[PDB]
Amino acid sequence: RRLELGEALALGSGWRHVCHALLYAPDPGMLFGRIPLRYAILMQMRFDGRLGFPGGSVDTQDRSLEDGLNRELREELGEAAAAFRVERTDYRSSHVPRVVAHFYAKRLTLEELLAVEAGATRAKDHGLEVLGLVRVPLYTLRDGVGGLPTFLENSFIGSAREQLLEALQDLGLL
Amino acid sequence: ARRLELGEALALGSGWRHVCHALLYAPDPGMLFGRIPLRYAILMQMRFDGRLGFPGGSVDTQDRSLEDGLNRELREELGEAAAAFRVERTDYRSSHVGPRVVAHFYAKRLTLEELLAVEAGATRAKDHGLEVLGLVRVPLYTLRDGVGGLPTFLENSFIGSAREQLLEALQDLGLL
Ligand SMILES: [Cl-]
Ligand SMILES: [Cl-]
């Protein structure tokens, strides 16, 4: 299932790689003035009706995983994604058809993150591979179901659900 | 989700909340992977509660009609761009009733250019990042595996009867 980046960097041509990024930004915002949002975190509704992360396939044209991640993101998200670069320091995990899924996480400013939302419609893949961007609600509502717990009952691509949870875990959100 | 006629629903007493939601759609000729027809761009939204639904909201006695209230909530939910059309009584579709809420549904044909400006602008709506977590188009196809596209979309969590309201409008749009 899961493996080391070197372990997977080491692999024959019978494997290709994908790169995906969880973009996040602190948020002092408060739903209804009462419920702290904590962080804005983007996901995308994909062409198959499943929730996933931005990025995509890295191919022989790329000098590295990050060059392919950042290229995929310019195309999926638009020009606001070139305000920053995802680097190896933002890498998190690799997972295994015959595909290795690399996963990254990049802290943005709320301002940067908002610019990415604002420009996402003009992106090439908008209204095609990507049906739109959504933020992950990080709270649980007063009924004990609304919010994250219900968000987590949606359809997710691949291992995106588990990537999400691990990263939230690692943000101190359980 | 027991149904109501619009007149009856309007007759209901001072102890009911009324909500109004709108399915905004334009025809779209494009093809996914240049081979799979989109047919229409139809807007839905990810709500604060992690459920998919339609733009709209509460309507109160301070609204001179359900329509005025819907256009007001549409402006809150999606921004300036939505002011460029009014959703009127002719676009009305159905009303449903738990806790003395009545929920009214509209469907409104926009021009593809109008629908885009709505998405382009939604990041500036008051509710964006609050009640509205972002917009999404409904995928109307089913993909070669017979599960991706629409039928997987339908397995996501929906608020109220948005699934039913959606499915209803797709049927009335003539989609099998
Ligand atoms: Cl490589
Ligand atoms: Cl009228």
Author numbering:
A (entry chain B): 5 to 100, 104 to 181
B (entry chain A): 4 to 100, 103 to 181
What are the paper's exact sentences on this?
A similar cleavage reaction was observed in vitro with other enzymes from diverse organisms, including a snake venom phosphodiesterase (SVP), mammalian ectonucleotide pyrophosphatase/phosphodiesterase 1 (ENPP1), Escherichia coli RppH (EcRppH), and Homo sapiens NudT16 (HsNudT16). In addition, although NudT16 was initially characterized as a nucleolar U8 snoRNA decapping enzyme, it is involved in mRNA decapping and expresses across mouse tissues. Given the versatility in the recognition of substrates with diphosphate bonds, we and others have used some of these Nudix enzymes in vitro for processing ADP-ribosylation to a unique mass tag for site identification by tandem mass spectrometry (MS/MS). In this study, we sought to understand how HsNudT16 binds and hydrolyzes different forms of ADPr using X-ray crystallography.
F36A and F61S mutants were designed to enlarge the mouth of the enzyme with the aim of easing the recognition and processing of the ADPr conjugated to proteins. Modeling a Ser side chain at F61 position suggested that the mutated hydroxymethyl group could potentially come into hydrogen bonding distance to the non-adenosine ribose of the substrate, which may contribute to its orientation for catalysis. H24W and F61S mutants behave as dimers in solution as shown by the size-exclusion chromatography profile similar to HsNudT16. The crystal structures of mutants F36A and F61S show that the replacement of the phenyl side chain of these residues with a methyl or a hydroxymethyl group, respectively, opens up the mouth of the enzyme. The structural overlap of the HsNudT16-ADPr complex structure with the HsNudT16 F61S structure shows that the serine side chain opens the mouth only by about 1 Å. On the other hand, though the F61S mutant does not change significantly the width of the protein mouth, the activity towards free ADPr is decreased, suggesting that Van der Waals interactions between the phenylalanine side chain and the ribose reduce the possible conformational changes of the bound ligand and thus facilitate ADPr binding. Crystallization was successful for the H24W, F36A, and F61S mutants and the structures helped rationalized the effects of our single-point mutations. Despite co-crystallization efforts with ADPr, electron density for the substrate could not be seen in the binding site of these mutants. Compared with the wild-type, HsNudT16 mutants Δ17, F36A, and F61S have reduced hydrolysis activity towards free ADPr, comparable processing ability for MARylated proteins, and improved catalytic efficiency for PARylated proteins.
